[PDB]
Amino acid sequence: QQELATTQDQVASIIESFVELGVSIYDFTPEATKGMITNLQRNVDRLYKLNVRSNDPIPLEVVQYIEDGRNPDIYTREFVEAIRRSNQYQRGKMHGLKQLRDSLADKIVDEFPELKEPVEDIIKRTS
Amino acid sequence: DRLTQLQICLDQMTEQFCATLNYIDKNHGFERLTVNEPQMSDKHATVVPPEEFSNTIDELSTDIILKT
Amino acid sequence: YYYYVDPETTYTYQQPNPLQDLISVYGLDDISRQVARTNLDGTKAVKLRKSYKNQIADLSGKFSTISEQQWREQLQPPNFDWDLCSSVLSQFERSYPSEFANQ
Amino acid sequence: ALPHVEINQVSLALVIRNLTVFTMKELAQYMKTNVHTNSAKKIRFLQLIIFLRTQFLKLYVLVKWTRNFHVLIDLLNWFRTTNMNVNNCIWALKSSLNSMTNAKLNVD
């Protein structure tokens, strides 16, 4: 997490260099803004190496929210509700499907007794 | 007559093999897991109560036995 | 009977078993505690802006919500000239430009 | 063991890397176009610094959100795969009935 913290810190440093550089070119001495743009490019190169050190990896709604201007907190939140709702959905399908399996299986059990013993093996297999 | 009834009963066996799974694969319920069961958004889930779902499972499980 | 338990194998219940609390199995309960609509105490954990206004609020200045994928499609170090650039920026006269807001 | 996909996501050193590459290309292009002309270099430079500034706002948002990326999606991708696996059999069950009439063959 320290790499993310230092690359984020330098990100804030260089965006602050864009702030003070814009204020400097608005309220315009050369050495201040020349040293400010060399600090800009230096912070750029530290973005290069710092993020090369970091290395972290419509379906890709993240970048869509970054470009359009949305908060990915609702993205990952809808992902929590999607994994929970999908878990209850699949488990519900398997529950009702098991109800059909033992319901119809027991119906065949009371249908004929000579087929009851093997279908018991069917309801006891894959265990 | 005697030859057609076998084909009709067979086609009904297949149509029941599909229709029996069609209802469960479309209308069913979730599970409480350990916290809650119903989601706040139940627009496309059309959750049916477990009573009519169980009775429907019993009926669809009975029709195939009757036809058999 | 034929085709009766013919694939003699223990095709076990699917390894990511939905019968188990998969949120607790994969350890996604902390991020759930962080991003859920309801907090662990009980109050509504919403109050999140539809935009990233909190993180531009971590910065300073007016930020009106306004390319990168195209860069990802076609990806070593660029070039630069110091004396030529310093000679380029050495020009800005003290006269004010046109009309643009400092908002 | 759950299948771990590799596509659908892009690394971070790539987005910042080609980012600042594109920004340096902008500083070179505007650097070559401002010299030729009288009051357009100023507003043009302000436009460049504010546009780069807001793209870098977007990247500030991404970097702050990143606090790995591949693992948090593959689970839901698999949960989406299983549902389709449940739905793929019904169409075959419908095609079998159509395949049975060709085998079925009263007499006058």
From Swiss-Prot, chain A:
It is found in: Nucleus. One of its GO terms (molecular function) is transcription coregulator activity. GO terms for cellular component: core mediator complex; mediator complex; nucleus. Keywords: Activator, Nucleus, Transcription, Transcription regulation. One of its GO terms (biological process) is positive regulation of transcription initiation by RNA polymerase II. The keyword Transcription applies. The keyword Metal-binding does not apply. Belongs to the Mediator complex subunit 10 family. Present with 1472 molecules/cell in log phase SD medium. Component of the Mediator complex, which is composed of at least 21 subunits that form three structurally distinct submodules. The Mediator head module contains MED6, MED8, MED11, SRB4/MED17, SRB5/MED18, ROX3/MED19, SRB2/MED20 and SRB6/MED22, the middle module contains MED1, MED4, NUT1/MED5, MED7, CSE2/MED9, NUT2/MED10, SRB7/MED21 and SOH1/MED31, and the tail module contains MED2, PGD1/MED3, RGR1/MED14, GAL11/MED15 and SIN4/MED16. The head and the middle modules interact directly with RNA polymerase II, whereas the elongated tail module interacts with gene-specific regulatory proteins. This is Mediator of RNA polymerase II transcription subunit 10. It comes from Saccharomyces cerevisiae (strain ATCC 204508 / S288c) (Baker's yeast). The gene is NUT2.
From Swiss-Prot, chain B:
The keyword Metal-binding does not apply. GO terms for biological process: negative regulation of transcription by RNA polymerase II; positive regulation of transcription by RNA polymerase II; positive regulation of transcription elongation by RNA polymerase II; positive regulation of transcription initiation by RNA polymerase II; regulation of transcription by RNA polymerase II; RNA polymerase II preinitiation complex assembly. GO terms for molecular function: RNA polymerase II-specific DNA-binding transcription factor binding; transcription coactivator activity; transcription coregulator activity; transcription corepressor activity. The keyword tRNA processing does not apply. GO terms for cellular component: core mediator complex; mediator complex; nucleus. It is found in: Nucleus. Keywords: Activator, Coiled coil, Nucleus, Transcription, Transcription regulation. It comes from the Eukaryota. Present with 1391 molecules/cell in log phase SD medium. Belongs to the Mediator complex subunit 21 family. This is Mediator of RNA polymerase II transcription subunit 21. It comes from Saccharomyces cerevisiae (strain ATCC 204508 / S288c). The gene is SRB7.
Swiss-Prot record, chain C:
It comes from the Eukaryota. It is found in: Nucleus. Component of the Mediator complex, which is composed of at least 21 subunits that form three structurally distinct submodules. The Mediator head module contains MED6, MED8, MED11, SRB4/MED17, SRB5/MED18, ROX3/MED19, SRB2/MED20 and SRB6/MED22, the middle module contains MED1, MED4, NUT1/MED5, MED7, CSE2/MED9, NUT2/MED10, SRB7/MED21 and SOH1/MED31, and the tail module contains MED2, PGD1/MED3, RGR1/MED14, GAL11/MED15 and SIN4/MED16. The head and the middle modules interact directly with RNA polymerase II, whereas the elongated tail module interacts with gene-specific regulatory proteins. Present with 6116 molecules/cell in log phase SD medium. Component of the Mediator complex, a coactivator involved in the regulated transcription of nearly all RNA polymerase II-dependent genes. Mediator functions as a bridge to convey information from gene-specific regulatory proteins to the basal RNA polymerase II transcription machinery. The Mediator complex, having a compact conformation in its free form, is recruited to promoters by direct interactions with regulatory proteins and serves for the assembly of a functional preinitiation complex with RNA polymerase II and the general transcription factors. The gene is ROX3. The chain holds residues 13 to 156 of 220 of the full protein.
Swiss-Prot record, chain D:
Coiled coil: none annotated. Signal peptide: none annotated. It is found in: Nucleus. It comes from the Eukaryota. Component of the Mediator complex, a coactivator involved in the regulated transcription of nearly all RNA polymerase II-dependent genes. Mediator functions as a bridge to convey information from gene-specific regulatory proteins to the basal RNA polymerase II transcription machinery. The Mediator complex, having a compact conformation in its free form, is recruited to promoters by direct interactions with regulatory proteins and serves for the assembly of a functional preinitiation complex with RNA polymerase II and the general transcription factors. Present with 319 molecules/cell in log phase SD medium. Belongs to the Mediator complex subunit 14 family. This is Mediator of RNA polymerase II transcription subunit 14. It comes from Saccharomyces cerevisiae (strain ATCC 204508 / S288c). The chain holds residues 81 to 199 of 1082 of the full protein.
